[PDB]
Amino acid sequence: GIAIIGMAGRFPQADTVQAFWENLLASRECISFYSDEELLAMGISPEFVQHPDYVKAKGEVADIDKFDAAFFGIAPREAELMDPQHRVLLETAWAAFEDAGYVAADYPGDVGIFAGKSMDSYLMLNLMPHFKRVFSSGSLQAAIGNDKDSITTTIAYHLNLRGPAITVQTSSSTSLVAVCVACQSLLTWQCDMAIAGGVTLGPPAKTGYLSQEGGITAADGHCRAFSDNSSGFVPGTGAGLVVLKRVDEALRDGDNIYAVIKGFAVNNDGSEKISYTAPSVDAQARAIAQAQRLAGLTPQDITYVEAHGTGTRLGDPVEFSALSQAFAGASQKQYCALGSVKTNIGHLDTAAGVAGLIKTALAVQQGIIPATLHFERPNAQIDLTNSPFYINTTCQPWQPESGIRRAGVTSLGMGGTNAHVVLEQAPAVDLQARAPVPAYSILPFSAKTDSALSSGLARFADFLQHESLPDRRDLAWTLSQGRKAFAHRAALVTRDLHAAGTLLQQAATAPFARGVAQTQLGLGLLFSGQGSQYQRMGHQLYQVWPAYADAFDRCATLLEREYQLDIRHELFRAEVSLAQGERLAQTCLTQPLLFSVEYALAQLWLSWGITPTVMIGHSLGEWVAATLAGVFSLEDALRLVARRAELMHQAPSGAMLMVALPEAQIRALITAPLAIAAVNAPDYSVIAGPTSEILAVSQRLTEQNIINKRLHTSHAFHSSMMQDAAQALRQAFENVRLNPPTLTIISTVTGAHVSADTLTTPDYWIEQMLMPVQFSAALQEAQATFDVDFLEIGPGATLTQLTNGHALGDRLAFSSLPAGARSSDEHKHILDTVAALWVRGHNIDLSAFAGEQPRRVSLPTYAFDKIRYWVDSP
């Protein structure tokens, strides 16, 4: 068949198909009656008002003047000359494609629109200035070019639809004829996805009709259908579009299927009638029997029928006669329902067949038949008791006998064209054999304006208060794979959806990432030194993520192949205790653990598709900023930092000291031979040395009342004490290969943009152990040459705390691991960095955070801001 995979459309007293399904489930009437005063104020002639046969009701779509011209690139001088049905069908088509879970502009295959349109009454006010000022008929040829035949080409231009763009144009069955033409085109393989429907919108916005004797219109405004008090119909206005796709493709791609269209049939009557404007029975019977013949369905299978049901005196017995003739092969008794949308919203002119198709597809998918209004007693020439049909007046649950629901929509034109479409139930979904939901998920939202982002967040806030909510891998997937990412964007990290609904109910100083996006050509990486680790560092990331797991497994097997370190036991199978913290405190174990964590976490961030420009390191962080630049291999790096750690374990005791003074003032104040260990900020510095004179310097620094801190380190680092251990790895260093770099390292021991040959020198890694890691000028050099965000790689938030204290120029630094306390929040922090990078504009595969086997669902669509465009000439 041809699966329906999404739908949209404004309606009378509705603006969404879910704000229309809940006007059918509430058994509402959507007709908007008026009074005298507001009608002559709209422009009703003084003769039309106080006329004894002038009814004052119609079905009103809400805002016909309100177009979002900035979304589509249209100037606010060309969109004012656009027919309102063009604008409303543009917004409806964008809404229908977003309801499908797809984007029109970048579908793989070929997408084409088949859509109809009522008569453009907007020109009948446009000609008044266009002709009574210049007296030229040139405007009419422009109308030929860009109005009457060009609705579907305007949609296909502004949404970039490559497939067929055909304006079918039938009198009152235009929409269901368009659905049938779309099904034919999808089955002759002209397109791989279609969007099909219609529109009818009147630039006379609020009006009544002058009902006359024996006239097709009702003399009360209540469209009573299939009843003995039926006096006619009432004119509605509305748009509507469905999205169609072949059912094996739609079931392989994992879309949501409302109802599979199994059969369809269009025909005409052709002079089997007493006059041209009078329907026939046998042609309608041929259409119904042909659609059920093509579907492969006996008429003992269809359980609901949406008749046309306009409520006129003459068309009602003809349609029931045709339905009885086509269903006459059945043997059950009152087993099929009957209905009509036109009781609720009125008789739509062009969008009538797709309003019934939306109502019938919703009724098939949900599984409950709506309530026909105004019906309490049958018609004189219709016998419900000796027919297979019943008309219900309450919202009745739909259970079939065989277990499969089937339906059918009938539409009738005024020229004679008859269309019938036979649906079915969507096939057996299986959402029980899937692996479970990811623990946290990112909810991305985006818009072209801050107003549209605020309104979209408000719409998702009201959507998330419902009891019926989709999955967390069905939602978010549709928000990443099924929405286009615009400038003004926002993002949440959630675990349950109702608390997300509460958070978007605030949408003001609420804890979620939010802001405008930019070009953002590249990221910068910062790597952590020794002294900020915790317990179970990367435990969640190891079991959840596969790339981090693979890199850590290869590092652990590589370390255990040549050494006796019990890697994967000190992190994962280690109890949370201070004995473990003192077990991993020493330098013999801490350096390869930080190397493995920072390397595998860097491989994770490169697996998620961000491209680093500059990779600043810190002590051991430089050894792995080497390794991502590929200056030597992972085997060489891991065994050589093991050799380094087992040399620097033999070094004697030595302490650190922090000072809040710049290094020039420290070098003007230091007298003992104590080298500067690290320069990190203007107001932060670290000095080293053996612990006795370090404590003496700290106690004399207490006398000047300057802030200082012990850094909890056993061995002195970045001072002249380790000369023997520095020299003792030269003979183990020279036997391996060193490669010129690839990625732009800058060196923290010199504070200089470091070149492609001076990493390769085997004495640079000797003097890197001794000299101060002068971080601040390296950071200011990266900030000077580039202009980039920074992402720390490592356990602590130390380097982020240093960096967010430097003039970055509109930029920000971001951590990728919690600072120890919240190790349980490893999975939430790394997904809140990704949610915070994505808002600024960085390129991350957000669909990598999806789940096992995702599917698409129906979420709220874009929220177009309402700007009035109207020529408005009396």
């Binding site: 004797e213 024996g214 006059s275």
Partner: protein, 66 residues
Amino acid sequence: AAPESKTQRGLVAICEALLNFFEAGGHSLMLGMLLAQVQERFSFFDVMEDASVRALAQLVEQEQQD
């Protein structure tokens, strides 16, 4: 019904034009001013007020007396 030799000419003009006509289900507003454009060979809101054969005869006689 039985015609009266002037409204007879009016109804023969109506029938030879195209065939109260409101209660006849085969007629609309377009065919309404088709008939009306035939009867200027001798206010349209008054035609929507009432357009029976007696109504057209009364309106044509009143407009001729005017």
